[model samples]
Target: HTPRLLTCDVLYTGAQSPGGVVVVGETVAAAGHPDELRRQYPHAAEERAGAVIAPPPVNAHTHLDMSAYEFQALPYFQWIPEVVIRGRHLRGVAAAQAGADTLTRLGAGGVGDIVWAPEVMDALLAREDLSGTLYFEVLNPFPDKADEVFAAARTHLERWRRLERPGLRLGLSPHTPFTVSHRLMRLLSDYAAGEGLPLQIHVAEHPTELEMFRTGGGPLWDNRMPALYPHTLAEVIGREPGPDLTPVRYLDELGVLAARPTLVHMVNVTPDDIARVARAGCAVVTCPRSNHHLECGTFDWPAFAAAGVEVALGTDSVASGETLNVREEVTFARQLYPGLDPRVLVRAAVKGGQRVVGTPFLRRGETWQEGFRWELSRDL
Candidate 1:
C-alpha cells in the first residue's frame, strides 16, 4: 500500500522535538522526525494531520457533577458564591449522567474527574464510557475529627472500589490544602499512598491561597465559614501561618506532597514550590481557560517543563472553562501562550494527561489513530 506522512509542530515522542507519524492505510507505519521519515520513504505521499493525530486528549481535572451549571466568568471568590452555591440544586446523578454523555460525545481518551457527590460516582461508575480516575472530594477544616472523617471516607472508598467498573477507577481529592485539615490531608494522602490509589489535590489556584498560608488572614480567611473552622488558621492546617509559609511548603513539611498526588490549578505556585514538586515527582494539571475565567493567574508552563515537571491540561468544568471539550482548552491555551510552541500544549493535553491518569495513549512504537482534523488554511 502507498504510504502517507503526517506531521505536527510537536510530536508525542517525549523529546519535545518537531516530528510526526507515518501512516499506511489505517495503521501507523512509523513515527519520528519528519525529515528522516521523508528521506526514508521518499515516494510516500504527504498530508497534514491537523494539530494532533494520536490518542484523544484527556480531561485531566474536571468537576463532572457541575456540568449542569451555566458558564460564568467571574473572579474566583465571586464565582463560588454566585455560581456554585446558587446552583447547588443542579448537581447530582442526573447532571453526572449528562456530563458522562457529553464526554462520550467529545470522545475524550480518559478523565480525572472530581466527583462532589457519592450518588454521582455511583451513576458514573456504571458507564462503560467513563475511564480514568474519579476522585471523591473530601473537605473538613477541623483536626480533632480527622480520624472520624477518615473512617467514613475509607468506608466509602472501599465500597466504591468494589463496585468500580472497568476503565473507571476510584481515587481521592482532599478538596484543597485549606478546606481539608492538615490531619485529614495526611490521613487521605497516607491511605492513598499505602493502597497505591490515585489522588488529586487543588493546591494554589488563587492569590488568596498563598495569602491564607503566609499571614493567616486574607479574603479566604475572611470569607471562612466561622462555624466550620477552629479558633485560628493554625488549628485548621496544624501549623502557625507565617510570612515564610506557603500552601505548597506546608504540605511538604506536613508530608502530604510525598504521597505524590496530581496537583491541580497550581497557577499561583512559586519557583520554590515548583522545585519541591519536581523533587517529589508529582505531576500538575492546568485548566487555563478556567483559571482565566476565574481571574486566577496563568500557570508557568515553560518553567514547569524546563524544571522536568510533567504537566497536563484540563477544562475544570463548563461553569468556568465554558466547555467539556478539552480541545477547546488546547485552543485557548495556544492563544493564552502566544510564545509557547503549540505542540507542547498539545503534548500536555494528550501525553502529559496519560501520565497523570496512568492511561496509555497512542505514541511511538504504537498504533496511530486520530479524532479531529487539525486543518491547514486552504491555499490562495
Candidate 2:
C-alpha cells in the first residue's frame, strides 16, 4: 500500500523531534527536515502548513463498556455501588455504540485497550470500527468460581485472538486483589505470560482495599465473606496480614508483579508502592480528573517520574471523568503536576499512550514533517 504523507511543524516522536519532516508508511519510515521529505517524496500530500501535528493521544485505561452509566460526582467509596447498580441496566449494543462514539470524539484512533468482562467484550467486538486490545477482566473471590472465570477468560481470549485485526488485539485483566483470589491471579498471570499478552488491573485506588487486604476488615467488608466461606477478619488477617502493606506489596506477595501488569490509579498507593512498581518493570496509567472527581486525591505523579516509570495518561470513562478526551486528561495532569513540563506530559499523553497500546507509529507521515495540520476548524 502507498503510505500517506502528513506534515506538521511540531511532531512529538517518542523522545526525539525531527521538527521539520516525517515520512510514514504502515509504520514510521523516517523523520527529519521537511526539505528532506520534499527531496524524498515531492509528490506526497502536504496536509498542514505551520501547525503542530503529533500522534493522537492514547487512552490507556477506560471502561467504555460501561458507557451507559451516568457520570456521578459521589465519593469514591460510594461510586462503586452506583456503578454496580447502573451497570445492570446496560445493554450490549447501546454500550458498544456509546463506546465507539466516545472514542472517536476523544481523538483515540488508538487505545491502550479496555478492561471488561467477557460478555462486555462480546458486545464491543460487535462494532466494526472498534479497535485496540480487549482485556478480559476476571475476578473470582470464591475458590469454586476460579475454574469458571478462567474458562470464560480463555474462551474470550481465543475468540478475540481469532478476530484480531491490525488495529485490535487481545489481553487479560485479573481485576483487583480484593475481588480475585491468589490462585486465580496466578492462573491468569501464567496464561497471559504464555500468550505474550498485555495485562491491566486497578491497584491502590481506595483505603478500604488496603484495609481489607491487610486486616480483612473495612467499611466495604461487612460480613460478605461468610456468604462464601466461614472466615473471620482475624483469621484472614492472621494468614495474610502485614503492617498496612500497600496494594503494590499485596500484588508482589501474590506474584502479580511477576506479570508486569499495567497498574491503574496509584492515587492511594504509598511511595514504596511507586518504587516497587517502577522496579517491577510495570507501567503506570494516571487518570487525574477521574481521581479528583471521585475524591481519590491526586496521584504521586512526581514519584512516578522520579522512579523512572513512563507514566501514561487516561481519561478513565465519562462515568468517572468530566469528559472523554485524552487531551483533556493530559491538561488535567498538567494542572496536577504543576512543576512538571507540559511538553513532557504532552509527550507522555501522546507517545506514552501509544507505547501502552503497541501503536507508536501513527504519528509518522510525510505531512507530519513539512509543517502543521489543523483538522479542527478555527471556529470550533
Candidate 3:
C-alpha cells in the first residue's frame, strides 16, 4: 500500500531538515517536488498545506510482560526480588494476558524489543495484538547450573521459533553478571554469537549493584531471598577485579563481552568502561527516568557519544519508569544530558533502537521492508 503525499514545511532528516516533499510508498521513495509527485501518482491521496510527516519513534528497551505493576514504584534492586517472588505465586498465564493488553493500550508503534522472563513469553504468545522481538531474560548465578539454564533457553528458542510471526523476533538476555555466573555469561554469549541472536543485559545500573559485585554484599542483602545468588552481593563485587576493571571490565574478563552485548542503564559505568564498550562495538540503552526514579544516577550519554558508542533509549519496566512511550524517554534523556542535541536523542530513540533490534530501515522516509511501519498521529 502507498501513503498519500503529506506536506510538512519542515521535515526532520535525523535531527535537522531541509524542507521538502516526501513521497512515501511501502517504503519512502526519492524526494521530489510536490507537483512532481502529484503528476507521478495522480489518484494518490494527498494532505496538502499544514500537515507534516516524521519517523515513528521506537521504544528501544521495555519490559511489557511485567505490566501487571505498571503503576508501582520501588527501588531498583528491591523491585526485582519482589517481582520474582510474587510472579511465581500467581497464575503466569493470567499475568501474561494482562501484560499483552497493557502493551497494546500503551500504543507502541515500533518497539525495539520486549525484555521478558521466559515464562512470561508463554503467556504473551496467547495474545493476538502484539508485535516486537522477545529477549528472554536468563539469570542463574550458580556455576554448575549453567548447563541447566542453557538447556532451558534452547527449549524456549525452539518453541518460540515454531510460533514466530512476521512482527515477532527472538533474542537472549543474560540478566546480568551478578545474577549470572561467569560460566553462564560465556555460555550465553557463545550461544548468541553462534545463533546470531541479539543480546541484552543490565549492567552497572545501581551503586549497590556495583558494591555487591565488588564485595558480594549490599543493601540487596536485606531481601535474602533463596532464589538470589548463593553469594552475598558483596562477596561477588570484587572477586574478579581485573587490571583496571570495573563491573564492565569484569564482564570483559568473564568473556561475556564476546557478543558486544547491549548494556542497559549503565549509570555506574566509568570512562574506562565507556572506552572499552566503544572498542568492543557494544551499544548502550539508557533509561534516564527510570534511573532518576530509582535513584540510580543518570547514564553518561556524553561520555558514550564521545567514546563513539551508539546510545539508544529505553523506558525500563513499569516498576520504575512512569511511562512506556519512547518520546518521553527521549525527553528525559535530553534533560539528563543537558546541552545534548535533541535530534541525536530522537535518532537514538528510533534509528539506534532499530539497529539494536536488527530491524531494517525503521527511520522515517525509509521504506518499510521487514520492519513494522510506525504509523503516528500528532496534534499541534
Best of the candidates, lDDT? 1
Residue by residue across 306-325, what tens digits does model 2's lDDT show? Answer: 88998888877655665556
**Candidate 3 lDDT tens digits, 84-167:** 454343335565565456555555445544545566776565446665667877767777788888888888887886776666
Best by TM-score: 1
- Please identify model 1 stretches exceeding 4 Å from their true place: 13-20, 66-75, 79-90, 359-368, 372-380
Compose the digit string of candidate 1's lDDT tens values, residues 255-365. 988999999999888899999999999999999888886777899888898899989988887767777778788888888888877778877888788778764444444
Model 3: lDDT of residue 358: 52
Candidate 2, residue 150: CA error in Å? Answer: 1.1
Regions of candidate 3 where Cα sits further than 4 Å from its true position: 1-13, 17-53, 67-75, 79-108, 112-119, 123-130, 221-227, 232-238, 241-243, 359-380
The 0-to-1 C-alpha lDDT of every candidate, in the order given, reads 0.79, 0.64, 0.64
Give the local distance difference test score of model 2: 0.64
Q: What is the C-alpha RMSD of each candidate to the true structure, in Å?
A: 4.2, 6.0, 6.1
Output the worst ten-in-a-row residue range by lDDT, candidate 2. Answer: 66-75
Ranking by TM-score: 1, 2, 3
Candidate 2 wrongly placed segments (more than 4 Å): 1-11, 14-53, 67-91, 115-119, 126-128, 222-238, 359-365, 368-380
